[PDB]
């Protein structure tokens, strides 16, 4: 009982896959840049000064890279779920989106304009806010996986 | 369009997206370019059995190639095959 | 043409991409090491 559906469920879950590969890189990413943060070795030491920055700059420049990939495959999975005529799954993946576009567009704090400067990323509260998003970000994705795995054998065994 | 139901060309029209978003992947996070732009014509360029300038040098982006070549075979042998009748 | 009639070229084309994914995933972490 092959189905338009059925293949966007094929679909996003292999592109799923890469969006948690994305969001397990972005956590060790942060995770790498909290361990080194609460380490003081670096500041405040002549020698290996550069280090922190240089590590700061590629984090930041990395994950300034990562992001946009992450947002419109979210978007492509609202629109083919558009036209699937997919409604149930379409309402449940909208809020991410809008998520998704109120983090890239809001520009809060008044501080940079880039998400990850690496100059006001550095604060403590930044950190831990966007370490909650992204573990909160990773159970969703995983729950989104397992739940397109399963409509998908449901749709086609149909 | 008839040759085809439209199920088939939706369907079509998001595994040239599907392709594309997975060859741009593939490429900029493990290298030897492909951007999304470039991917997209490669991928249109071979569904109408023109090719492109730019052609995948890793092997992760050839299996790619090689099963979009084979699935656009499979898919012009089959619409151009009773395709006066329709017109 | 009904999709019922060349499904398997989708179940194919999938596959592979899920197979030249894997295979990214194993190339990134031999050039990490």
């Not at chain 1, 189905?3 to 790498?32: G, K, N, P, R």
Request: contains cysteine; glycine residues 6%.
């Amino acid at each position: 009982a092959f189905t338009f559906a059925a293949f966007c469920y094929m679909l996003t879950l292999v592109l799923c896959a890469s969006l948690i590969f994305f969001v397990i890189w972005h956590i060790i990413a942060f995770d790498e840049l909290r361990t080194d943060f609460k380490n003081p070795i670096d500041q405040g030491n002549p020698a290996r000064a550069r280090e922190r920055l240089k590590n700061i700059e590629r984090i930041c420049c990395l994950l300034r890279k990562l992001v946009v990939p992450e947002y419109s495959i979210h978007g492509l999975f609202c629109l083919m779920f558009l036209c699937a005529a997919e409604w149930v799954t379409l309402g449940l993946n909208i809020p991410l989106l809008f998520y998704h576009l109120w983090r890239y567009f809001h520009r809060p704090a008044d501080g940079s304009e880039v998400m990850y400067d690496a100059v006001s990323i550095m604060n403590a509260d930044i950190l831990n806010y966007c370490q909650k998003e992204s573990w909160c970000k990773l159970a969703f994705y995983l729950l989104s996986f397992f739940y397109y795995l399963y409509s998908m054998v449901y749709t086609l065994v149909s | 369009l008839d040759p085809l139901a439209y199920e088939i060309w939706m369907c079509i029209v998001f595994a040239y997206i599907g392709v594309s978003v997975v060859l741009f992947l593939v490429s900029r996070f493990s290298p030897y370019e492909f951007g999304i732009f470039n991917s997209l014509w490669f991928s249109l360029g071979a569904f109408m059995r023109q090719g492109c300038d730019i052609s995948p040098r890793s092997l992760s982006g050839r299996i790619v190639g090689g099963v979009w070549w084979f699935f656009t075979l499979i898919i012009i042998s089959s619409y151009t095959a009773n395709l006066a009748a329709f017109l | 043409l009904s999709l019922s009639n060349v499904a398997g070229v989708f179940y194919i084309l999938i596959g592979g991409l899920g197979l030249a994914m894997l295979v990214a995933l194993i190339e990134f972490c031999y050039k990490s090491r």
